[PDB]
Amino acid sequence: EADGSGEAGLARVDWDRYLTAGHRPLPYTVLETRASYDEEKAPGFGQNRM
Amino acid sequence: RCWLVPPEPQVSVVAAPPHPLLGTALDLVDATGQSFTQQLTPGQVAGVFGQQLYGTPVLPAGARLEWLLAAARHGSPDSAWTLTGIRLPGTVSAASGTPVALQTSREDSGDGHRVRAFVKGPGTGGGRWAERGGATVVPAVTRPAPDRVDPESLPEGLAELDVAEVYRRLWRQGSDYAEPLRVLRRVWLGGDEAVALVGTADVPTGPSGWSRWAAVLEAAVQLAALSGSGPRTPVSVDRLEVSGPPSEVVWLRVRHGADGAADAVVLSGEGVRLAAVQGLRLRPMAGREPAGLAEAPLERHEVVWHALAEDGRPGAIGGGTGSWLVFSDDPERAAAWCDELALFGVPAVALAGEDAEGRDGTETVPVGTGDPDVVGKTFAELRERGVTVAGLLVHDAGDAREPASGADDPLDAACRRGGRTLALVRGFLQEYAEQTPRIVLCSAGAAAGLAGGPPHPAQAPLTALFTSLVWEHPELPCAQVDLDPAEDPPTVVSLLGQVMRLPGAGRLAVRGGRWFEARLERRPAPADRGERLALRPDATYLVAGGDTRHAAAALE
Amino acid sequence: SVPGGGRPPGQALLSALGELHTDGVAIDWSQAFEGRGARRVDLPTYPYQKVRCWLVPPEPQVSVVAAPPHPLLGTALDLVDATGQSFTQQLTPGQVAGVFG
Amino acid sequence: QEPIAVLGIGCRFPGGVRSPEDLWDLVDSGGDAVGGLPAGRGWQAGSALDGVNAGFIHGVEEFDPYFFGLDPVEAAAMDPQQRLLLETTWEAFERAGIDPVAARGSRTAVYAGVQFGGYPLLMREAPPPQVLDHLGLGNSVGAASGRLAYQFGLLGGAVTVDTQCTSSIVALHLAVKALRNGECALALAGGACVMSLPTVLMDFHRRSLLAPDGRSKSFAAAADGVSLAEGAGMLLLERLSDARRNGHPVMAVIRGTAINQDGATNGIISPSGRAQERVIRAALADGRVTADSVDAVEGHGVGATLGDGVEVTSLLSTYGQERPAGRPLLLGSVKSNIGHTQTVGAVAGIVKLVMALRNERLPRTVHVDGPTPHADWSSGTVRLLTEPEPWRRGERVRRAGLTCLTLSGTNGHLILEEPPADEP
Amino acid sequence: PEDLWDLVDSGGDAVGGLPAGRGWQAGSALDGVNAGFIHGVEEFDPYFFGLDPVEAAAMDPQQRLLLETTWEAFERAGIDPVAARGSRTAVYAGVQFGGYPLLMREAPPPQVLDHLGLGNSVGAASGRLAYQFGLLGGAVTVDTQCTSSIVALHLAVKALRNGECALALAGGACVMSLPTVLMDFHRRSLLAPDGRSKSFAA
Amino acid sequence: AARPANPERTVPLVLSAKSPTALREQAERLRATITAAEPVDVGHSLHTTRSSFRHRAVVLGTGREELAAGLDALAGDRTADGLVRGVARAQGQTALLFGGAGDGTSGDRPADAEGPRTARGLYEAFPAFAEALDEVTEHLAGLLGPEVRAAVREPGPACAEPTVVGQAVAFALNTALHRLLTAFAVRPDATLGHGAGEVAAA
């Protein structure tokens, strides 16, 4: 930890409780992954026939 | 015939499954009391243990109460049951992915019909089997019950609640429930009693038969827990009485009429009596410890600055629907950014603190006079002119106050900025917050770990003021953009572009050309390094500034 | 800006196209390779970013006896309140003729 | 374009059918074979199969080890599917008129459709060591094509094929191509499907895919679901020119074949429809036949509510544009009488058409209460055979097609013709 | 191919120890057995092929290796897999039933149980390749034990000569998800005690 | 091959991946090949033997040492000259802006000669431009006489000035660049022409 460590800590924390505790109506990009993006998926192998 | 297996008998019994908490009945030859055993594998445990406390799976209190009733009735045709003296010590839990062994026994006391039922939970290594409940059983209840009570008479004195807020109140008490135990459908509560509607309470083996009582009794615990505050869990019941399997709909009444205890009754869709409970106590286990129970390991948590190399292109400012206010330590910088925004048709207004001269036609604000009233009385005047605001830019000069004043003190350099910027941020929001404006706190040399030299300690009040907004005025978008303290600042359209791509809030930095974003991320923390460590013996140590409780452990 | 850029004149157009190709346009690079002596050569294949996918959790690294139970004595029970130890076993019909010799 | 001759068919099918003549009586009488779960198999299935009905072979648990030179322990260790192939193959030779001893040392090829039957999983205890030695080869999918070649002393290539329900038409296609390439003198082609375990019934019942009465109501407006069944069958094939040189009897002539995949894209284009329209065109072109000359098609017709409509549409997109005046395409499916029959779904259809050509009549499709509304019958160029119709030898060569489909995406088609039938 | 050439030309052997990380429960029954295993066959990248990680758990390791090895065979053939879609390419895969569902020590979760069928049926392997790569030619699976690869090539060569297809993709897979093939050859003493096939040696 | 000699013209090297990490590992793999094979053969291969995924990068350079320095910059994830990065979105949405000659007289006029003096260099770099520029210049020479060939060969401040020579050269160079971009498979969904350039936009 000689350099590049920054604001750094050691604790038992559950961050998914932390952002859902109190209330919060919009994202906060320090705790949460920034955004979704445009892509699509196949219907599955057999499933379109059944 | 040529087959691996000989033919099965042409007639056989229906072979209905054993109740999942009590399992196979053992057949010891000489034994007086009957006993039963079950193993739950890592795939079964999370199915029966449908409640979580602080993330760890736990056996619901209604399921412990039904486990004792299922163990009580085992060999008997009787449809009416009385359980008394019920005690339920501790929390039954299993760390995710771990086996559980369960055991139970019936001892006939010889006191007429009186049977004692016990329930026991697992141990390994230095651990051994431990008690997790007990009750006394009598059959043949042999007393009448009331005539039909109208369910539509029950809610008339009481306020209705949203079932979404009922389960949110429970989440703020450490408790979450899987779908088979989310059985409430309407709730009414007020003063010292409550009533509710319970659906088909269909636990595993419970879409028909007696097992449905596990969820109907758990609904009584959810309701009894709803009236108090702080974490609490059932410890005792002094009577439970049940007649028959419970109907597809039932009505619950729960009352807090005693000295710190609850009583309850259950009625059918017809208004007929099904069950009653007396002396349901949660209070002797109010405030039991979460720190010995939570699933999370000890870890190292660090803020990492990641490059926005993917997709870091500024985009467009959302039109001139409201002005941008620019406030700066330097009137020339405030003017330069207002002139830059004007070229794009985004309307802008320049402001300065009144210890700076009005050199270039800015508005001037009494900032430094640390009262939100005089700064508010300034920002209010622009609303009386008819100014609408889309957002505010706040800009800070960095270390330049040191050579400009000719004296050094970093604690004074911090404390001078805090009060000035608090007066600005409050004095703005008190006049415009209904418009949902955007705030940008553009520090310089505040962000650690990145290039641009060591961060200036005097900038720390800006990061504190940013993070204080995010949890206190959550309707407002805001962002911190920490500039390099030595390079020329980027074009103001580059700031507002990469800022307006944030919904909600975030921390950003610029060093050379690149944009960076702060994320908080986690890695394992080997405490066994300290178990291997020895402090060097030929030395003094100082432990400083603590209270007694920390000092004793530090010295230990 | 398409014709305008850095000192080597071709890098202006290739950088302006490279940004459009990056942003989404299906640009055909073949004009940059025309007339030049271009051959095909072999290359590395795609680097997959793998994770575990299996129906069963990985085996515990603990040594144990392969089949310890004695045929007649069987498995020891752990009834908590018991005054003395007990053991029980089932023999299935193929095992019965194996033990009863 | 050498025509390939069916010299003999052996089969085992639901409802005690042991020959082509037994199948003919069951279809010409308009019966159905679907019934209750098999007694005397070792099944410990609970309430999960209550009300399930399917086309079982009664007595599949019984065999005659000494006739085939096996010890009874080896005969007990074998997958039931290998035992039905071995019994059905000897019956195929006996109808073809070949002495099975005179077939030894021959360049006969074997192409078998078989899928892993699960048979060793019936065991509760670990088996005795004398069974444990024999279990390996006796339950392997590849060994199923090898035991036939060992028992009859055949020297040609031996292959086991799996493509779900199309396994018999794929096996038959590779045999037709092996004979046309001159790889072999005769080719033996077919398959087996026997449910030693209940798991396929449960996996379809858990999803409510099975029809509630267990009937495949082929092309009918009711179209409740699918219907599973057992079966085995073998066809013996030779080049028509070599069959005429030797004087072996020809039952029907296979004229051309094709297999294709329905691929993958948006279902809006009907990928499964487009694939069938190409597989029919390919099968006609391989045999050098023309789409006006086919009289009837033995369709896949499983009874899936949207699945039958795509087939009928593909036939209207293909045969239904080129009919002679007053000669509409006759359509039906044997899968209405005996259920689906899984890997042998193509053999069941060939037995029906061979018997139809012999008796000069086409059988009625059972349970056709009314044509499905998911296709436009208004051209009149295709019609379901709701009553039997005569099909006499004459100036127009009698030809018929077969279609077989499956959910892995394989589709296929065959064209069949009359024997040349010169006067004695 | 270059790794195989480096191994073969450097004169190495690749037989080794029984794989950990697979869920095996084998006791002394394989003590001292040596054989050649694919390490990391329990690892895969579901997102590249468009699979949810629940289907990647249900799939037979043999179907996973063919689907990875097919993309690799196309990339070295110099044919873009996006240019292969809609082609008359045939698929001929040598595969055998791998036993994989029989590792489960406890009943499956309710989602994975509805994927297991087409995840493990042998005839699904040819169809799944034709689905992923959009290939319209025939798709068959063959079993003839050890010679399944020459049977696949023979049928593919004869298909290309007859004009059935424009390309053919031919090969196989073999992954020992269960110990039982090692155990039975060890019980019958068919295995070499050092695990080496000394191909024509005294 | 009788393979020709050339000067060190720039090579565009394209990489793509389905997530950010796979791009950086692909740059680590490629560094050994570009430092051994010739760069024009490596670049020509990646344009045709690999698919176009959602995450993309372009590396530009005149020779092996520069291309290796750019690929190392991608591998460490640090910005450098001649490297471009991004995430593609499938929508077309492209338009093209065209200008007349004379607006360059408003200010910084020498830069609107230096742009054309830079653009003249494209006549040696790209074959489609030289054909399109001749095919327009030899056509304008019929209306205006011989000077248009000399002017196109020496695009001075006339290209920035309201003049017949200036307007002829501006129409020539814009027509030639349009035929260049439409040879690189860009296809404009709209065009907009400022002032006297409207004929070129049309």
Residue numbers in the entry:
A (entry chain B): 1670 to 1719
B (entry chain B): 912 to 1467
C (entry chain A): 861 to 961
D (entry chain B): 33 to 456
E (entry chain A): 52 to 253
F (entry chain A): 457 to 658
Please, what does the article write about this entry?
Here, we present the cryo-EM structure of CalA3, a chain release PKS module without an ACP domain, and its structures with amidation or hydrolysis products. The domain organization reveals a unique “∞”-shaped dimeric architecture with five connected domains. The catalytic region tightly contacts the structural region, resulting in two stabilized chambers with nearly perfect symmetry while the N-terminal docking domain is flexible. The ~360 kDa megaenzyme uses only the KS domain to catalyze one C–N bond formation (or hydrolysis) and subsequently release the polyketide chain.
To confirm the binding mode predicted by the MD simulations, we tried to prepare cryo-EM samples of CalA3 with the amidation product 3 and the hydrolysis product 2, respectively, and the two complex structures were finally obtained. The cryo-EM map of CalA3 with the amidation product was resolved at overall resolution of 3.84 Å and the amidation products were captured in the KS domains of both chain A and B. The benzoxazole moiety may undergo hydrophobic interactions with A336 and L439 and form additional hydrogen bond with R1718 which is at a distance of 3.5 Å. The polyketide chain and the pyrrole ring could also be positioned by hydrophobic interactions contributed by F236 and Q147 respectively. The C–N bond-formed benzoxazole moiety is shifted approximately 3.0 Å and rotated ~51.5° from the non-covalent 3-HAA substrate. Similarly, a motion of this unit combining movement of ~5.8 Å with rotation of 34.9° is also observed compared between the amidation product and SNAC-N1. Together, the visualization of the products in the KS domain verifies the basic binding location in the substrate tunnel analyzed by MD simulations and further reveals the structural flexibility of the polyketide chain. Based on the in vitro reconstitution, mutagenesis analysis, MD simulations and experimentally observed KS domain complex structures with products, we propose that the CalA4 ACP-tethered polyketide chain first enters the substrate tunnel of KS, and the nucleophile C197 attacks the thioester bond to be covalently acylated. H332 then may extract a hydrogen from the 3-HAA amino group, acting as a general base to perform the nucleophilic attack to eventually lead to amide formation or hydrolysis. During the formation of the carbon tetrahedral intermediate, H372, K367, L437, and L439 may perform the 3-HAA positioning function.
